Design an enzyme around this catalytic site. Structure first.
Site, PDB file in Angstrom:
ATOM      1  N   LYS A 121     -15.117  -4.124  24.266  1.00 38.85           N
ATOM      2  CA  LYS A 121     -16.359  -4.888  24.221  1.00 38.85           C
ATOM      3  C   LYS A 121     -16.228  -6.253  24.892  1.00 38.85           C
ATOM      4  O   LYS A 121     -17.138  -6.696  25.595  1.00 38.85           O
ATOM      5  CB  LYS A 121     -16.816  -5.060  22.770  1.00 38.85           C
ATOM      6  CG  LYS A 121     -17.145  -3.749  22.073  1.00 38.85           C
ATOM      7  CD  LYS A 121     -17.656  -3.985  20.660  1.00 38.85           C
ATOM      8  CE  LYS A 121     -16.605  -4.659  19.782  1.00 38.85           C
ATOM      9  NZ  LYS A 121     -15.371  -3.837  19.670  1.00 38.85           N
ATOM     10  N   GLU A 151     -14.475 -14.719  16.778  1.00 35.33           N
ATOM     11  CA  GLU A 151     -13.447 -14.012  17.541  1.00 35.33           C
ATOM     12  C   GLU A 151     -12.188 -14.813  17.879  1.00 35.33           C
ATOM     13  O   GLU A 151     -12.027 -15.961  17.467  1.00 35.33           O
ATOM     14  CB  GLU A 151     -14.043 -13.409  18.814  1.00 35.33           C
ATOM     15  CG  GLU A 151     -14.925 -12.186  18.548  1.00 35.33           C
ATOM     16  CD  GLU A 151     -14.223 -11.126  17.708  1.00 35.33           C
ATOM     17  OE1 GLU A 151     -13.097 -10.726  18.073  1.00 35.33           O
ATOM     18  OE2 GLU A 151     -14.799 -10.687  16.688  1.00 35.33           O
ATOM     19  N   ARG A 152     -11.294 -14.182  18.630  1.00 27.33           N
ATOM     20  CA  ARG A 152     -10.022 -14.790  19.000  1.00 27.33           C
ATOM     21  C   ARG A 152     -10.153 -16.076  19.800  1.00 27.33           C
ATOM     22  O   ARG A 152     -11.054 -16.209  20.630  1.00 27.33           O
ATOM     23  CB  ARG A 152      -9.181 -13.783  19.787  1.00 27.33           C
ATOM     24  CG  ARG A 152      -9.304 -12.353  19.284  1.00 27.33           C
ATOM     25  CD  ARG A 152      -7.949 -11.690  19.100  1.00 27.33           C
ATOM     26  NE  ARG A 152      -8.089 -10.314  18.627  1.00 27.33           N
ATOM     27  CZ  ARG A 152      -8.543  -9.309  19.369  1.00 27.33           C
ATOM     28  NH1 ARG A 152      -8.895  -9.522  20.630  1.00 27.33           N
ATOM     29  NH2 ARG A 152      -8.654  -8.093  18.851  1.00 27.33           N
TER      30      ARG A 152
END
Lengths: 477, 467, 467
Positions: C160, C186-187
């Protein structure tokens, strides 16, 4: 005055906890200081539990509450027929106010057992696959099922469009749909003049929960107006699934004991006290009726899921659509194999039965051999005729969106394949045939098309006069 | 008595009496004010708990919208009394025994409590008589013992109603005695239909000469929870009269008794208890039990209740439907996959029992063939997953025979209905015992190994399967 | 105003004001003292409930470690104001609109509330334009309607992000308008990466001549719950400016909007409500909805949000990801099994729709082939379980053709990335509409029945598949 007024104690998550208000009734609107409306559901020992109706961000712990004394009334009249109405029946299409004379309740009892009569009156949807094997009649509840993007809304789209003037009043209720998507729809009904008789009770995902329940109830009432008045209605509640979800949110936020999939203890009386408000009143009430085509989105073809499970045991037939059978040419995709109709052929004329019924027997036999064709290394002709006449009728059942065929255009077209005409032909072409031939008969032979409807059945003449038509017509391919 | 409403949270009312007045549990209460400008007494409730602090809880049998705190409640001094007796036949009743058929008030002799103690252990019986229905699967693989309580199971839309109809057609219309049909949690149509049909067939009074042999009690879907948890008990309080007072043999047709439990689950958590296995009430077995042992045959007469049960999500493990089984001298579990095949009535020849499946009560020819038929139906079923991938080329000539024959059994076990003349498209056929027993005997013998499969599909008798 | 902290149970604060002061719901509060010897105001919270008893509850947008009871809270008098406008491009923002890119303070014209009413029903549009991406599966089996809201689904590690990158590469870098990328749960790497890459490609200011066409708002994993439940709304309050104030066509790249919901589940039970289906909040649909209809195209301009969604345990049934679907004019459900095959982007050609998949908006050649391709992909998929055990020897010469062709489709539906040049090992290829449409037409025609399967695997055009 702790009799008709009271203080707000807490405004948490779209719910309020009024204190006082001794007189309030179960199901009675109350008013706030900042002018926010709300219904009453928890008349607890010393505190009323009100479920707000809008941005509760306004209510302030200390503000007073007056008692409307009114039990959720909704205006109604002819004045609508073309206005994208709200949740409390107040325009959201900016064309001014709605001239209301009378006003009926959001919630009210449904036609009993005497006040009803079986379904005899037909209901044409403009679909060859529906009004020929999945008969829907006025007053009957017919559920539409499918996963995401499964041509459901299209089924409803065509259907309402396919309604001749002065024939049926329609109510389109969108619950949880997108403002934009409802626009794309509210638009495609106008350009075909279908919105001169259809109301749009819709409540977007952004609207507060406490309305996404009443959405269908709203569209129900406004439709009941025509019922009792010897008029017929057709209501499509877009995703009851979405309304069921909305219901879960109120009980939880109202701190009420949940169960399966968190759904409370009354997820069956949201639809049973909605879909049962649809029926065919007896001639001793006006012959009026209302047909509900509710929508319920499935999850990975899981028809046994709770909400999908309940609804199906409330409706009188289904029209399952398939996620796997789309692209394979079946557009629209009707799982006529599992699609039923409790009312039976009783919701059809005679002309249709004479063909459709025979079409039922055919497309029911092919269903038993269908898997063989791809592995038919050496089958018998008594079986080949089936895998022959099989995928032929299919391409007839296929339909381009937005174009609802008339009944004449319905029977006539089916007569072609059902009688051996489109037989020896090639499948990857057939669709073009009908498209051409239909217009050919509409253009050159509209004379017979009128003989069909008025007579409501094909005479021994029109038949042979159709034989001469189609035969010589396939003979121009 | 005179207590005041204190809490109205949905169908549940927390009335409050004085420390003296304490309506007994199950004793019905009645509230005085309700709907849009007008004073009606429809609001009837049933006491179910003494919360303590001078306060009883209760569930209303009517919708509590419009109700207010402070409104006066009254203790009738006993439980809800439904009027019973002959003056009920040909009419349609409420959960409160009020005529909903618009044919004048009900002229009864005496009322009767829906809460009555089941028969004593010495008022029971052991006679086991058959009940020829006319379905090529019932009377042969799972009969009906008279006085017995039949369980007709199946999931959403399988044919239970159409099934309870052909039973009223094949057995009720001709039954030499009275009958009753309970409207427990179902479609209104299924009421109007059964009504206008039973009218034309003359089961109801064509004229008020009162020759009717049926009494209806309808509490459909739309009704609140504390209604369908009890219309079963009204349909039954009227049945617990013809049975012992007029010493008649009555029939109790309950279209879905699950809806009786479902509606019971709804008041539970709403009353303040703790849920059980699969959200169901802790009192799941005390409720569908007390009202399933009154539905029975005593020495005074008989009750042959042909009951139906809804199966939530096709799951039999589910607490509500599973609970029913114990209370049945037979079963008829309808399948959705076997229904997806066009075989109707969609009855799993394997999953449908009957205590009277004994040679000591029916016969060896009826007994043996019954098993012989199911043996092969076990064979082919255990050969499916095998051949569906391992083909047939290596199957013995002694096993490929099981296939053909079984497929001729599974198809001869298909029969249209006089009610489903709209789903099949062919004229119905009543297939009694003898005709069924022999027809299959001629199959299990290979005297029809030549006949094709579709020759037994939707056929009346074996002869109609050679034609 | 001036209230005092009363309870600090995790990210949730129960401030207490006087009976007069009552911060409005959603109006942000700010606490005065916190970390290891030093007085900062980072502790900002959002009112979300009026518990009653002169007390509001609230969730902090910052870590509440070090906080004490008694500490003074203040009512700003409105909700959290993020500074918006052109002076945001090329920078990195906080959930509170504070520069986290170390390039000086943000010189904005005006601030803006993250809580704004969606467009009115008469401010919507119906124009349907395409969005050629360059992936041999998107523009052909599930296009992108401009102004539309794309849903990119998939489970833990499927592509994604790599997908939201090639979209910023194929569409954002060349987009004739502004863009925005929301950092929602997220990261941190996925931030630094996107940053140093968008730097070299010149999307950011190489020099402060301010030619940037992108604005970033990063609230990564590490942040508390009441942050990623809102950075989506900061990335969007800045987008709800370029859209209507500067009448521009903006892009809203949200890397995972699920993390927006996940973080929402965490404050729920923590606030005192009752969980829902699969532990999720009761307000699951009121939260991901109000902030998904602001993310949209109005007559004033446009918003084409290419959004991503995390799928908990590969399950689509899950409430959080399933809820998204309704808010999408397309989808792209990535598979883990189809990813375990080496076919990238791992996109299920069957499970990925788009409203614009109509002949009235794209074309018949684009329409037919699209279906023709999926037809066979339905065929072979329904032939798998069959042949995987029944072999092929008895398969018709008219069906063994479906296999080969399909396998050539399922492989021609594989394309490397300009970002994934480290996972494939081959140079990327931009494959627009026409090249894709024709390439498959030459397949479905059997004009390539000779070519092997691995000839279409990881290839640019059909020509690169004959080479």
């Amino acid at each position: 005055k702790v009799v008709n007024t009271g203080t707000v104690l807490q405004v948490g998550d779209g719910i309020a906890r009024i204190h006082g208000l001794d007189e309030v009734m179960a199901g009675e609107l109350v008013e706030f200081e900042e002018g926010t409306i709300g219904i009453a559901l928890n008349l607890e020992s010393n505190n009323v539990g009100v479920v707000l109706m809008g941005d509760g961000l306004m209510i302030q712990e200390g503000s007073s509450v007056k008692a409307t004394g009114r039990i959720a009334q909704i205006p109604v009249s002819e004045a609508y027929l073309g206005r994208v109405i709200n949740a409390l029946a107040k325009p959201i299409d900016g064309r001014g106010e709605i001239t209301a004379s009378e006003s009926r309740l959001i919630e009210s009892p449904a036609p009993g057992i005497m006040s009803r009569r079986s379904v005899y009156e037909p209901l044409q949807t403009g679909l060859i696959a529906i009004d020929a094997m999945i008969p829907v009649g006025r007053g009957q509840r017919e559920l539409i099922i499918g996963d995401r993007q499964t041509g459901k809304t299209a089924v409803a789209t065509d259907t309402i469009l396919n309604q001749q003037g002065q024939n049926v009043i329609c109510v389109y209720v969108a619950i949880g749909q997108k403002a934009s998507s409802v626009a794309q729809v509210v638009t495609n009904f106008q350009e075909r003049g279908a919105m001169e008789y259809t109301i749009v009770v819709a409540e977007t995902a952004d609207s507060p929960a406490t309305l996404q329940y009443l959405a269908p109830y709203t569209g129900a009432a406004l439709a009941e107006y025509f019922m009792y008045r010897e008029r017929h209605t057709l209501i499509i509640y877009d995703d009851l699934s979405k309304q069921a979800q909305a219901y879960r949110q109120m009980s939880l936020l109202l701190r009420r004991p949940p169960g399966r999939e968190a759904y409370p203890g009354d997820v069956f009386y949201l639809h049973s006290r909605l879909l049962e408000r649809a029926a065919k009143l007896s001639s001793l009430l006006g012959e009026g009726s209302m047909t509900a085509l509710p929508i319920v989105e499935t999850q990975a073809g899981d028809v046994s899921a709770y909400i999908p499970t309940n609804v199906i045991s409330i409706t009188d037939g289904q029209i399952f659509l398939s996620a796997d059978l789309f692209n394979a040419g079946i557009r629209p995709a009707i799982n006529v194999g599992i699609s039923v109709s409790r009312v039976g052929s009783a919701a059809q004329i005679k002309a249709m039965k004479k063909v459709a019924g025979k079409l039922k027997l055919e497309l029911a036999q092919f269903a038993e051999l269908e898997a063989f064709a791809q592995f038919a290394s050496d089958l018998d002709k008594a079986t080949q005729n089936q895998l022959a006449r099989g995928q032929r009728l299919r391409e007839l059942l296929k339909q381009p969106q937005s174009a609802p065929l008339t009944v004449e255009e319905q029977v006539m077209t089916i007569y072609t394949g059902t009688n051996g005409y489109l037989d020896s032909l090639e499948l990857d072409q057939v669709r073009k045939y009908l498209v051409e031939l239909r217009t050919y008969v509409k253009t050159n032979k509209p004379e017979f098309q009128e003989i069909i409807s008025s007579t409501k059945t094909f005479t021994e003449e029109a038949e042979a006069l159709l034989k001469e038509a189609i035969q010589e017509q396939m003979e121009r391919f | 008595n005179l207590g005041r409403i204190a809490q109205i949270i949905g169908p549940v009312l927390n009335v409050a009496f004085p420390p003296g007045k304490m309506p007994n549990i199950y004793n019905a209460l009645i509230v005085k004010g309700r709907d849009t400008a007008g004073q009606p007494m429809n609001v009837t409730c049933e006491v179910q708990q003494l919360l303590g602090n001078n306060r009883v809880r209760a569930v209303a049998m009517s919708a509590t919208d419009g109700l207010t705190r402070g409104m006066e409640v009254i203790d009738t001094g006993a439980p809800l009394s439904v009027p019973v007796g002959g003056p009920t036949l040909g009419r349609i009743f409420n959960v409160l025994g009020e005529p909903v058929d618009n044919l004048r008030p009900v002229d009864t002799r005496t009322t009767s409590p829906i809460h009555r103690s089941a028969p004593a252990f010495t008022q029971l019986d052991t006679k086991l008589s058959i009940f020829e229905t006319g379905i090529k699967v019932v009377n042969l693989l799972a009969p009906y013992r008279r006085g017995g309580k039949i369980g007709l199971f199946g999931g959403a839309g399988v044919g239970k109603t159409v099934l309870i109809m052909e039973l009223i057609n094949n057995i009720a219309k001709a039954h030499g005695g009275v009958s009753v049909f309970g409207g427990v949690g179902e479609r209104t149509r299924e009421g109007n239909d059964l009504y206008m049909e039973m009218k034309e067939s003359g089961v109801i009074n064509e004229q008020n000469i009162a020759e009717s042999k049926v009494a209806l009690v309808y509490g459909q879907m739309n009704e609140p929870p504390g209604a369908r948890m009890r219309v079963g008990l009204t349909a039954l309080t009227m049945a617990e009269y013809f049975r012992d007072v007029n010493e008649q043999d009555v029939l109790l047709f309950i279209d879905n008794i699950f809806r009786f439990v479902q509606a019971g689950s709804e008041v539970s958590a709403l009353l303040g208890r703790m849920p059980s296995a699969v959200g169901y009430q802790p009192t799941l077995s005390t409720e569908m039990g007390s009202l399933q042992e009154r539905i029975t045959s005593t020495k005074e007469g008989s009750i042959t209740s042909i009951q139906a049960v809804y199966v939530p999500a096709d799951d039999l493990t589910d607490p509500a439907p599973a609970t029913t089984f114990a209370h049945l001298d037979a079963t008829t579990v309808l399948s959705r996959g076997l229904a997806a095949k066009g075989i109707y009535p969609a009855v799993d020849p394997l999953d449908s029992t009957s205590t009277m499946l004994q040679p000591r009560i029916v016969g060896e020819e009826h007994y043996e063939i019954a098993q012989r038929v199911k043996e092969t139906l076990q064979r082919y079923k255990e050969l499916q997953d095998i051949i569906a991938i391992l083909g047939l080329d290596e199957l013995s000539e002694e096993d490929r025979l099981t296939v053909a024959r079984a497929r001729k059994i599974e198809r001869f076990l298909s029969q249209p209905f006089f009610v489903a003349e709209v789903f099949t498209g062919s004229p119905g056929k009543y297939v009694g015992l003898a005709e069924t027993i022999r027809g299959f005997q001629l199959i299990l013998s290979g005297e029809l190994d030549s006949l094709p499969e579709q020759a037994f599909y939707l056929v009346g008798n074996i002869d109609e399967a050679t034609a």
